[PDB]
Subunit: 512 residues, 4 copies
């Protein structure tokens, strides 16, 4: 029997993974024993990125194996064209039910449904082709209904469960717990749906997309996770001397430093994200770690059910996140722009049985578009022609293929959406608001469609403070990275029908 458990957390940074911290001799300032078990038993990928942000685009790439340049779900609220083959439909093609807990943040294709469809009122709904067994639902109604049915009285504005405890509490980074008990938290909800689904399967082969919302904000935690980590034990945020000096690097950086609000990160909070002080940012980081450890506790319950039913060694387990989180770096909160912390994400894979590379940490450059090909390959399917990504299965046996990619790539599109509208400030039209990034161990190149490019020397400037793109001494290097990025564009043009050929013998297909 073969099972696949795809765990997708939200907003969890790659540098909040204890197995990698310890390997580098750093203090592992947070506890994730269940993730650590996956790392001891499988392969941890230390240079994994999402190919775009925020949730809607990231999940389009994860669930189609396509770059943003091909899926075109370029921002939250922008439709996903129905033509793209997604993981749910591909799973049905190999005889698996594509069971899903959590959310996909997918706007339907308007050519397929009425313009009055309620799914157009929200950031996104479930992607067509999945079988929902534990949906957060539009406006988190699935979760709130479950809390209410469990007998907990909700406030009139339901997200006020995430105000800090106590009528005198000041909204923002907090040392207080939220107003929801642990047993009715959202992580508990998704976990109960996972256990219900696995118990219903009763040993039969499964695919399950187990989505967790946490550690997505609001950065407030149920007791006692709110108090589990001391602010002084957290890694310091990395940022310029002040927000103006930070913003001077690039107009897009200035837009986000100026515009991001605390209320998007802490329920009811007022003021700008960029003005948080070091103590507030350390408290935010401690609460973020508490939310992470709650998820890890919950995963322990899922893993316990797999152990008790004898299914652990039959299950391919993939742990990843949709995207990262700035967490105060560069004066930013959220998943925006071009910096490493928004795009670097965990990826740990435990094969069935005793893993040949158990415990290894892989530096090969991997991208979220590789996850769908990996799952389909493992289940014996053909990888769709159109996918941009490649199967990671060679990394679980002999290691990095000799012809594997030598750069990481990602994209970001910042055209206007209802809650964030940079076009007027930037002076740009909607089809000119994008960037792409190419990077390796030494250099990082950020190319904007219609704004200045950026170039960083990562050995000397690992935190991306010193743009070199306009320095004439770097002209040959900038040329080289722009050339690699341009080749990458040409190599990833759409592949839907390009293997077919007419000819004297009729219709044929080219394989190489």
């Amino acid at each position: 029997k073969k099972n696949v458990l795809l765990i997708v957390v939200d907003q969890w940074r790659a540098d909040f993974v204890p197995h990698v911290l310890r390997a580098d001799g750093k203090i592992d300032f947070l506890k994730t024993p269940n993730l650590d078990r996956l790392c001891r038993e499988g392969v941890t990928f230390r240079n994994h990125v999402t190919t775009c942000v925020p949730a809607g685009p990231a999940r389009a790439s994860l669930l189609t194996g396509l770059y943003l340049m091909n899926h075109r779900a370029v921002q939250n609220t922008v439709p996903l064209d129905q033509r793209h083959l997604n993981l749910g439909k591909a799973l049905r093609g190999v005889g698996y039910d594509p069971a899903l807990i959590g959310y996909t943040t997918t706007v339907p294709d308007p050519r397929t449904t009425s313009p009055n469809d309620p799914r157009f009122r929200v950031l996104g709904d479930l992607m067509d082709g999945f079988h929902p067994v534990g949906a957060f639902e539009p406006n988190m109604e699935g979760y709130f209904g479950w809390v209410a049915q469990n007998g907990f009285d909700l406030p009139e504005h339901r997200p006020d469960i995430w105000l800090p405890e106590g009528e005198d509490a000041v909204a923002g980074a907090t040392d207080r717990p939220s107003r929801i008990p642990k047993e009715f938290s959202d992580s508990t909800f998704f976990t109960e749906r996972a256990l219900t689904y696995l118990k219903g399967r009763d040993g039969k082969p499964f695919f399950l997309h187990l989505g967790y919302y946490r550690p997505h904000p609001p950065f407030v935690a149920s007791a006692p996770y709110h108090a589990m980590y001391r602010p002084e034990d957290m890694p310091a945020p990395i940022r310029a001397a002040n927000p103006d000096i930070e913003a001077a690097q690039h107009p897009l950086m200035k837009f986000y430093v100026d515009s991001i609000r605390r209320g998007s990160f802490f329920q009811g909070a007022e003021g700008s994200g960029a003005t948080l002080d070091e103590a507030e940012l350390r408290q935010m980081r401690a609460t973020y770690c508490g939310l992470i450890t709650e998820v890890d506790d919950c995963l322990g319950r899922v893993f316990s059910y797999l152990d008790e039913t004898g299914q652990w060694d039959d299950t391919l387990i993939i742990f990843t996140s949709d995207h990262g989180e700035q967490l105060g770096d560069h004066h930013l909160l959220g998943k925006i722009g071009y910096n490493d912390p928004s795009f670097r994400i965990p990826l740990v894979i435990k094969d069935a049985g005793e893993n040949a590379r158990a415990g290894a940490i892989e530096s090969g450059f991997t991208e979220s578009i590789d996850v769908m090909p990996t799952i389909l390959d493992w289940l014996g399917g053909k990888i769709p022609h159109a996918c941009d990504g490649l199967s990671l299965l060679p990394f679980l046996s002999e290691g990095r293929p000799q012809d594997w990619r030598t750069e990481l790539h990602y994209e970001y599109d910042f055209r206007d959406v209802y809650y964030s509208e940079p076009q007027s400030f930037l002076g740009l039209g909607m089809n000119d608001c994008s960037l792409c990034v190419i990077q390796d161990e030494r250099y990082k190149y950020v190319h904007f469609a219609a704004l200045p490019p950026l170039f960083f020397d990562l050995r000397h400037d690992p935190n991306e403070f010193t743009n070199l793109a306009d320095d004439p001494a770097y002209a040959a290097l900038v040329r080289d990275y722009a050339q690699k990025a341009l080749s990458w564009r040409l190599k990833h043009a759409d592949r839907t029908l390009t293997h077919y050929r007419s000819g004297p013998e009729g219709l044929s297909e080219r394989s190489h």
Copy 2:
């Protein structure tokens, strides 16, 4: 605010509706106080039929507003063509989320999915376009997973929860309870999903398809519903002197009398349905009533939540069943053939506010294809051109329209499916295995595509024992009913594009 609650039970007969029994001066031998409330407050339709059986075809007609002659989902296991507009997609067209609890028994269109799709392994899965919030799931996994997560230990073969209590129990009609407590029954499950969904909506407008499996078999009930009704208080089954005399009426009757097995109606039971004695049939009927009263108790919890939140007077409530049940009549169990008890079904409608016809019983002839037009009309939508049915809203105000139909119509297709294969016995090919029925207060005509027809005088022979179709004295009457049925066929040919016209002014549409 406008809400719609569409309650769809399964396998509940029209003559098991106490409000109608009492109106006719009959003993109301079962208790349904919550349904009785709907009847006191709304309109009870006493001549409602499903336009086909069993579940898959019945639910295709209910959820598309089309006769079987147009939807072509002619038996369980036969695909529903994606071209037909269903109620879920139509609801999205009026801005409603098409939330659904229970099941639709819909086989996907093979042109839309892989032939390996797991949805082709089961009798049917969820119809495309609905939003599931409480699915029974393939093989009832949703229910069983919920029972297991509630801490109840299930037997190795999970349907053995429906064996009668006690290792010494004989499977079949029983005076013992099932092996599942009331608090973990399937009716409790669907009810908890309904409460969870309504609590999540928190007062916002809703559509909810609230499906119950009961009183579908196995005919066994959780305590104390198994003992709630005395067998001697049940209405007697109506059947011929013996199964051979019954079967002589028609080859299709013979096929079902010979083939139907007790194990399809009582978990683990052996033997033929037709050999049940009168006492066994009375016990079966008493258990069936117990399952009905459990559903009614559950509806009381849903109605209580609507009352407490002040939504009752804002909600159009429609109560109906997918189809009926022979329940021993004519030596048959199940929903098959051509007799009234398989096709007659409850229908009660309570409008928002104080209903103009509260308490009335309507004799106008209504069909399940009318339900979707009624809901869309009530929500301010246009009724799709293709629907065969008509809105029932006039019946809630002034009464039966002057041009309403004057006959009831239904269809049955009995081509081979994996668990019932009459073609060899009947000597028929797959496209020749159907019948249609037309009837009014006086006469009933059953026309087979490729077997003898039947004709009944319902005043003198209300129970359909005496075929008159081959009696020369009835030639003019049989002619007349065949002519009405043939006109009905011509009038209901597909209407997808037939209102459009080319012409000198370009494309236009005819409205009359």
Copy 3:
């Protein structure tokens, strides 16, 4: 090598086929030596009907193998749903180019094109899936452009080429030629396109739909075909004592007797069709024969090219018409209503090589829906599941199959179109304006959806003057024919997906 030549004339009656006239000892009052060659070498089907009229519906049935009840292109100007598989697409499935000369009169599906498409300004355009090599074109522009490019000066209103020669001519039935020379006639045009296409093929396998407009009206002929037949040698029209007595038979008969205009049949003519006298009708018939003989002369040129290139014995030749013509019978002109002369059509089939039944006349009942299955069968294709018709190939070898149909069937829908609007006169809505016909050697039954039925004893009343449907002495016979027609409806419900099945082994198909 295998070729198919499908010759489709327009408006040519089955009783204008000399081989059948001579077989019955009647005078063959018109000459068709080239058709007579096909009859001597192949099989002539004497009981062939189109399953509906006029051109648009007839050609939908011919080119899909479907009854009107399934294709739903129910009148000229009504769209053909793109879902139906047509002969052109099916030919591509067997590797044949679906070359077409003439027209198909097909209104596009509005869901597939802009509402501004010029194809919605005309009665119909080319059916999707064919390869046009000689289109009449919208408004006959293809023909008129060819005449103009040939150097012939056209009048300002181009159809005035069909006024009778001479400024003093009275428009109507005429003993004068038209104003177009034979070398620039429409039959010459289609023939030149056929020769161009066959010469381009240069011996390679072909399918060609060779459409002729003639003998469709206006009933005027190029010299000397206008004078080739004497009016006194024509068969007399068959009609009641006067138009009022004719019209009394049925409201639909009255509508057409009252409404049909001479201008629809003779260019520029005034007055009603029903008031033509016997001499005028005989002249009309003589001109109609002249147009037929012109087509036959043209076919001789096509056949000569096949003989000279050695392809005759490699070619399946099918000669047929889209529909018939009343030609004055029952006071009617055109192709309307329910009488035999509108629906009976020629069908002659010459197989490749020496035909086993060369010269035979077949009385088995054949329908235009059989033609597409016949062609696909002959080319080695599978007949589409959805077709209503059956292959005629058994008739070319051993003869009529033992299980062949025992009645002929056809349909007519008379809902309002821009140039003929009977609904107000009849008092009917658009979905109630149809009839179906079932008949055999003895009896004919015409069933209207919402008007009185008709029944004829064809031995005693071969010309359909005496309705018997309301005579009580015929009640059992009328019953029997209504029952056969109702069975036919049930047997021909749509078959798109009804062979598929879900089940424990996955998706399967039933073959019987």
Copy 4:
């Protein structure tokens, strides 16, 4: 009234346009009086390119307004995805019939038709959505059938009409005429179809795509066009000292210098294209001019019909070519690679009425993707969101828009097709065989996906002999052009749905 005549020749170079030659003080060594009339009356665009080559890709860009990066019909024999909106369907959206003479070289989408479709046996067939009124047809059957029907006896192998006259003739560049008289030439054929179509329209508004095959090879002409130009009066080919020195520039150049055969350019010829001597190339150029003048003579007949019917001043006339021709430059024949002569093409536009810029020559950079937007704009349509091109109408009134593009762009994909397979020689996989080009008045940058780039200084090296891309002194310039090309990629990602947005008010669209 508004008409559009879109004249599309094949393989005609931009530097074979006399109006531009004379403007630059060069000898106009060929005569095109009818094209010269369009130039005197309209605007001549001197920096127009096709965005890709050869015919199939070029015509996909012309007829969709999309770059190859979006249409993906990347080589002849590769399907065009049906999702792209083409000019024919867009014309129907504005009420115009999309009449077409010539060919489009379009391989159908395999998801829309049988794999056995004969359209998969040829390089391409007609694009879906056009109305053919003069097709060359598969294998030029339309033309050959027309020649045969005109009474001209064709040789057994029909293309042998293009052998030079006389049994002793040596195949290759020739001073002899072909074996087809002028009155039966292919240019005469397309012209007769144009006149037939316009005469059929009889003054009604038209769109006509008037395609000519010439001056596509074989480079042989009907008498007396074969002798109209002296070889010594032709411009000399521009090429390196020998083929080896030429080929050293780049592996793709070497592939084509080594592989191109004379038989692809002269009927029956043997040997390599690269070994033609200067005299042979001058004769080839003189014959090429003869074919051009034959097309111009033919256009004079079309223009004469427009003048005589008073339609000239009501007609937007656009003259262009699908692509250019190397004509011996760089040792190459055909339309391949990256050099200017393969991609630069004529474009002349005459507006209705007296043109504001009559006679002007425009240096603004225009691309073939601009043609479809121009036509739709002129007819009052909306330009489809997805188009990459922009309307040229501002150039006919006030001139180049201030925000017009500042570089020309084109693409070439050289993955294996049945008659040319460079992948093995180049060592590349199928998705790595492309290049893109960006250029302006000063510099040209050729970027290969997986081979070395090229960079040319066009003032000092107008003929592209001296690659500078690997010269360190050019690093900043190469950087700049790679950056412009990378921005162009980002700006032209697919736009199908990217203007739509979900949000609190429902579905909306962004316009800027």
